[PDB]
PDB file of C-alpha atoms in Angstrom:
ATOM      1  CA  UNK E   1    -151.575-118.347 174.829  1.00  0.00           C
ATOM      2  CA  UNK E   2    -152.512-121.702 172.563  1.00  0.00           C
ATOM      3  CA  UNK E   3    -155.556-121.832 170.084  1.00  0.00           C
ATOM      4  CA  UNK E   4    -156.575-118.122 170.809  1.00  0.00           C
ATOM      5  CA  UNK E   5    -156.078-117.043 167.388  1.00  0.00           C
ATOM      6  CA  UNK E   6    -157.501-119.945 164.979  1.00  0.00           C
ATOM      7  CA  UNK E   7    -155.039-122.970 164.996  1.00  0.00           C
ATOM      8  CA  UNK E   8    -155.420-124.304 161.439  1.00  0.00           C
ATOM      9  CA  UNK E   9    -156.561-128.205 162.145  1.00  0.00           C
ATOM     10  CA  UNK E  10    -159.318-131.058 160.946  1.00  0.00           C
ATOM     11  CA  UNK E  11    -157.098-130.645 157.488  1.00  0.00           C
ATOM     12  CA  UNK E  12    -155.497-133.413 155.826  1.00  0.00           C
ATOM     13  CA  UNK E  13    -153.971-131.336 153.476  1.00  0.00           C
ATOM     14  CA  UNK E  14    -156.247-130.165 150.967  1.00  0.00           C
ATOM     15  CA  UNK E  15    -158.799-132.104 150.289  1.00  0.00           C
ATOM     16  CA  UNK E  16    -159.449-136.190 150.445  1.00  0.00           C
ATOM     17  CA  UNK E  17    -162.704-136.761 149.218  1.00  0.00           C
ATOM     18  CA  UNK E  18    -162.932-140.183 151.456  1.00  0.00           C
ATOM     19  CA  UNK E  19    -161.566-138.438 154.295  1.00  0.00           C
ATOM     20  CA  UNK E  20    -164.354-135.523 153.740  1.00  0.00           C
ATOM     21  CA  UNK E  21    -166.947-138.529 153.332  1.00  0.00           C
ATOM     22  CA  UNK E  22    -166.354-140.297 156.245  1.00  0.00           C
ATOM     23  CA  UNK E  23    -166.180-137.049 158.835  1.00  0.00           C
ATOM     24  CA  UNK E  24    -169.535-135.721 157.653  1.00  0.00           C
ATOM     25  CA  UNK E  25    -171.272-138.954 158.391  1.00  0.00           C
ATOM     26  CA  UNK E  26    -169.210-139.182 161.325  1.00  0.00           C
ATOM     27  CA  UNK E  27    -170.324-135.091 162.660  1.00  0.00           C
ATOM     28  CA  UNK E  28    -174.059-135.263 161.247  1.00  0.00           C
ATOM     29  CA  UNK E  29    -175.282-138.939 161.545  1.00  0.00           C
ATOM     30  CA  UNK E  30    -176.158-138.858 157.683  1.00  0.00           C
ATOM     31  CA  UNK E  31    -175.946-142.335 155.482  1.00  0.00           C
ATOM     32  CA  UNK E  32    -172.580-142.664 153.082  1.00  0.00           C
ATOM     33  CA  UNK E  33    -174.511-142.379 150.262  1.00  0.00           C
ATOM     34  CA  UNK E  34    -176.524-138.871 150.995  1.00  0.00           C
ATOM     35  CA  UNK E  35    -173.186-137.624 152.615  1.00  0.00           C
ATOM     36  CA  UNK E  36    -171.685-138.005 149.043  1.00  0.00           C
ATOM     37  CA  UNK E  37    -174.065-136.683 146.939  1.00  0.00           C
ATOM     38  CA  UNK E  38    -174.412-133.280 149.229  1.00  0.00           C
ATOM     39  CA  UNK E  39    -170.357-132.787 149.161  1.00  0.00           C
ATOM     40  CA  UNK E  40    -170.316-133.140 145.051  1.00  0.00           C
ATOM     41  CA  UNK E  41    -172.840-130.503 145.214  1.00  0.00           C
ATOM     42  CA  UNK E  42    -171.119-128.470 147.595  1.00  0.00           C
ATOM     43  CA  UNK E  43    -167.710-129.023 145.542  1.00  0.00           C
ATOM     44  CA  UNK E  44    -166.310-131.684 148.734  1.00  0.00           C
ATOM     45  CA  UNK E  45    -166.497-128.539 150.928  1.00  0.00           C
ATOM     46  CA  UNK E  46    -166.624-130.431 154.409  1.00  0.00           C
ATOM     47  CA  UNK E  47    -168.082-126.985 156.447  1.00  0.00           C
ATOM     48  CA  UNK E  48    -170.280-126.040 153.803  1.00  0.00           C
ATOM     49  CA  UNK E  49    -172.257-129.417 153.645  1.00  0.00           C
ATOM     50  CA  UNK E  50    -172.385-130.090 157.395  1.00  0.00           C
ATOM     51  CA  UNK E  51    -173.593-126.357 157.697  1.00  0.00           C
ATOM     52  CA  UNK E  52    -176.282-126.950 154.751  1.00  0.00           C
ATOM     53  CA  UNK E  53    -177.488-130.337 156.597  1.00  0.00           C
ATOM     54  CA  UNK E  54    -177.608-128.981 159.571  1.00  0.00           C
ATOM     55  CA  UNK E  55    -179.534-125.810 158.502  1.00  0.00           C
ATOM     56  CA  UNK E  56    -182.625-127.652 156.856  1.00  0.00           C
ATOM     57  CA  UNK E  57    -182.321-129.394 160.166  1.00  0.00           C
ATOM     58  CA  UNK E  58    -182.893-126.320 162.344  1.00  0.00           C
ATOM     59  CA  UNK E  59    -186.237-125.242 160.483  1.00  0.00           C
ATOM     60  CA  UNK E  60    -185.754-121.678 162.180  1.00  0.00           C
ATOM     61  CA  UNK E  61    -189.578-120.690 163.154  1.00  0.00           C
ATOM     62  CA  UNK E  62    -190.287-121.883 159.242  1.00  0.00           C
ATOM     63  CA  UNK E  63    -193.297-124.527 160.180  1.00  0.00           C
ATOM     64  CA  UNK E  64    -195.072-122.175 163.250  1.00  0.00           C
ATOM     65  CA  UNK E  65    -195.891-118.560 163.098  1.00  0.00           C
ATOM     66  CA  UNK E  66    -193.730-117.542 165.916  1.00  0.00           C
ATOM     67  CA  UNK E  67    -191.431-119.781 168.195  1.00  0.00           C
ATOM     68  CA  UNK E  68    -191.050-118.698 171.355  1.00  0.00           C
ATOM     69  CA  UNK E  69    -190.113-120.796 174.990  1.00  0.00           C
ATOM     70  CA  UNK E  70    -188.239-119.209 177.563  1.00  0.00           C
ATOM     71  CA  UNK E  71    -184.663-119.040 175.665  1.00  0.00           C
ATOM     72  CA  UNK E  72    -181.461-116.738 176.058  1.00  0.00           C
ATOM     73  CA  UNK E  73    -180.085-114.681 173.927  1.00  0.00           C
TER      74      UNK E  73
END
């Protein structure tokens, strides 16, 4: 029994703003400069920003009426 619970990692310590830089660009494929500017508006909150990237990448049925292909869920 090994990670089953949570297992506290990706953490430097805190927070390293460079550290938090360099991971987002690394995990969403955004430029250095955009990957900055998102994290001082999300307070350097690594999640946060790569889940508000991400998001306005999704576009979740927000352009067509109703999207619909054979999916599971």
């Amino acid at each position: 029994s090994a990670e089953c619970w949570a297992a506290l990692l990706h953490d430097p310590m805190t927070l390293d703003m460079d550290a938090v830089l360099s991971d987002f660009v690394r995990s969403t494929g955004a430029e250095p400069g955009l990957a900055r500017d998102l994290l001082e508006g999300k307070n350097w909150d690594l999640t946060a920003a790569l889940s508000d990237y991400e998001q306005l990448r999704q576009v979740h049925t927000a352009n067509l009426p109703h999207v619909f292909n054979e999916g599971r869920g």
